[PDB]
Ligand binder design. Structure first.
Ligand SMILES: *[C@@H]1O[C@H](CO)[C@@H](O[C@@H]2O[C@H](CO)[C@@H](O)[C@H](O)[C@H]2NC(C)=O)[C@H](O)[C@H]1NC(C)=O
Ligand SMILES: *[C@@H]1O[C@H](CO)[C@@H](O[C@@H]2O[C@H](CO)[C@@H](O)[C@H](O)[C@H]2NC(C)=O)[C@H](O)[C@H]1NC(C)=O
Ligand code: CU
Ligand code: CU
Ligand code: CU
Ligand code: CU
Length: 496
């Protein structure tokens, strides 16, 4: 409902999405943050005007447009101290980029520290006027976007380092243990119509097992990649993932519970927690009293495939690529490690280090955390789960790319012929060996990290410095970008 050219003014104020009042982050004076839309191929010009005054939730900011490749615009990707210095308070900064060849469901969020958990995070839809699945539904609009989010009554830097959520929010509304009469979100449908619901996880931490009483869900898109339609009666969505599903509203006129069970915190639906309302036109304005039936056809990621049936890059055998890397997870001194290194943000953003003459992974900071990738090549990365990295299952995200999930969590098999492609994948439980492949078609430094935001904060990330020799020529930067670091570095600490 705004975009693709729009101002996004960021400020602080009180919100009460679960009927408990707390300070948080507002975007264009609202919470939850507003939906942005455009069409396939559009240029997006989003002018981020930072007016925040609260240092505990951070006065500075930086925005990632999650799922967008940013080819030629690596300076606009978002991550603080990888692709830019943060925008300073009392300043604005224009993200100006295009989205060739992409359409689906995305989202934006702060990518500075754990700031998005304090409320800067909203959905984005990029519509396809020739969507291959358009004929499966009648309604696809602002009222078919469903967000899931975790909410905490203490701020990200006020509560525990890995806190437990006080409420799940669905479209920005939900109940906690103490606010059992708080307003629930309502999603309205008309009997006889078919809906493209675009489900996006804005979570900082928990994954949700999502279902709607009485209704099956036909999944047709995962993380902005078109799928062959695949009907399920429930699905598990990890932080930062998206699915589109068609719901055919062909049940009796009634209210039905929409359920989103987290894997930690309150794990039941007593008093309508973890829930929202699917309301048919004509039904009474009351809560559902429908019953959950056991899921006997849950989404299984290894059973999903792309609409085109695209092979994984490379040849069908392990190590069948130009470069194979394994990421060994661990945890010590309160920090996560990958291959023995913990990510600390460097003071010079990784992109600026490359523009300033850094040539190799060994040159780039932080030391031990940066991997050089060859240009125009195929890559395979395995991310084996281990109890040495507490808080599994960890959902890893690769910026600047979609990847083929050749091996999924909970599966023993490898699929090179027709695997799902996506951009956030659960790395599963000890014994799994989640393995992805992608092509280096996009020069620039790109983050690869756990999307549980509290774990990224604790160092659980690396940077893929893809095609270093071509980064500068491929990504010419605007002078407003070049002015971010001197403005930020001049702040005193209390103004950060
Ligand atoms: C800045 O934001 C923080 C975090 O939201 C606010 O922190 C609150 O601090 C009070 C007073 O100490 C506590 O009782 C609350 O529990 C805190 N809230 C949260 C959500 O953790 C702080 O009040 C904000 N500053 C201003 C001026 O509003
Ligand atoms: C996860 O899979 C990776 C990739 O197959 C395994 O690492 C390979 O292990 C074999 C057997 O030691 C070596 O020959 C290769 O050199 C390794 N490849 C890389 C790129 O390092 C890894 O051992 C698997 N981990 C688990 C727990 O199954
Ligand atoms: Cu993200
Ligand atoms: Cu991302
Ligand atoms: Cu994690
Ligand atoms: Cu990221």
């Amino acid at each position: 409902a705004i975009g693709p050219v729009a101002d996004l003014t960021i400020s602080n104020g009180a919100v009460s999405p679960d009927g408990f009042s707390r300070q948080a982050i507002l975007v264009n004076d609202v919470f939850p943050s507003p939906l942005i839309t455009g069409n396939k191929g559009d240029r997006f010009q989003l002018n981020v005007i930072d007016n925040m005054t609260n240092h505990t939730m951070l006065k500075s900011t930086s925005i990632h447009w999650h799922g967008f490749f940013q080819h030629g615009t690596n300076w606009a990707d978002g991550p603080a101290f990888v692709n830019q210095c943060p925008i300073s308070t009392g300043h604005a900064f224009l993200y100006d980029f295009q989205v060739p060849d992409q359409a689906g469901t995305f989202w934006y969020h702060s990518h500075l520290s754990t700031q998005y958990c304090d409320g800067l995070r909203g959905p984005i839809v990029v519509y396809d006027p020739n969507d291959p699945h358009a004929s499966l539904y009648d309604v696809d609009d602002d009222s078919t976007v469903i967000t899931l989010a975790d909410w905490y009554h203490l701020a990200a830097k006020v509560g525990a380092p890995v806190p437990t959520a006080d409420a799940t929010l669905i479209n920005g509304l939900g109940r906690s243990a103490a606010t059992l009469a708080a307003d629930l979100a309502v999603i309205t449908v008309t009997k006889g119509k078919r809906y493209r619901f675009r489900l996006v996880s804005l979570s900082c931490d928990p994954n949700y097992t999502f279902s709607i009483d009485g209704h099956s869900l036909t999944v047709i898109e995962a993380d902005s990649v078109n799928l062959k339609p695949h009907t399920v009666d429930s699905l598990q969505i990890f932080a930062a993932q998206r699915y589109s599903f068609v719901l055919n509203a062909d049940q009796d006129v009634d209210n039905y519970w929409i359920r989103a069970l987290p894997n930690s915190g309150t794990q039941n639906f007593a008093g309508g927690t973890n829930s929202a309302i699917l309301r048919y036109d004509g039904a009474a304005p009351v809560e559902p009293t429908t019953s959950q039936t056991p899921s006997t056809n849950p989404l299984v990621e290894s059973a999903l495939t792309t609409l085109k049936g695209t092979a994984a890059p490379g040849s069908p055998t392990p190590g069948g690529v130009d470069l194979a890397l394994n990421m060994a997870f661990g945890f010590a001194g309160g920090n996560f490690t990958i291959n023995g290194a913990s990510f600390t943000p460097p003071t010079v953003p990784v992109l600026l280090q490359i523009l300033s003459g850094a040539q190799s992974a060994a040159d780039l900071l932080p030391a031990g955390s940066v991997y050089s990738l060859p240009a125009n090549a195929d890559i395979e990365i395995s991310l084996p789960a281990t109890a040495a990295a507490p808080g599994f299952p960890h959902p890893f995200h690769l910026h600047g790319h979609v990847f083929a999930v050749v091996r999924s969590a909970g599966s023993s098999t490898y699929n090179y012929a027709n695997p799902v492609y996506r951009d956030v994948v659960s790395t599963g439980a000890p014994g799994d060996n989640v393995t992805i492949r992608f092509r280096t078609d996009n020069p620039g430094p790109w983050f690869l990290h756990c999307h549980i935001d509290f774990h990224l904060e604790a160092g659980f990330a690396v940077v893929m410095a893809e095609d270093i020799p071509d980064v500068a020529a491929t990504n010419p930067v605007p002078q407003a970008w070049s002015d971010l670091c001197p403005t930020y570095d001049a702040l005193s600490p209390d103004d950060q």
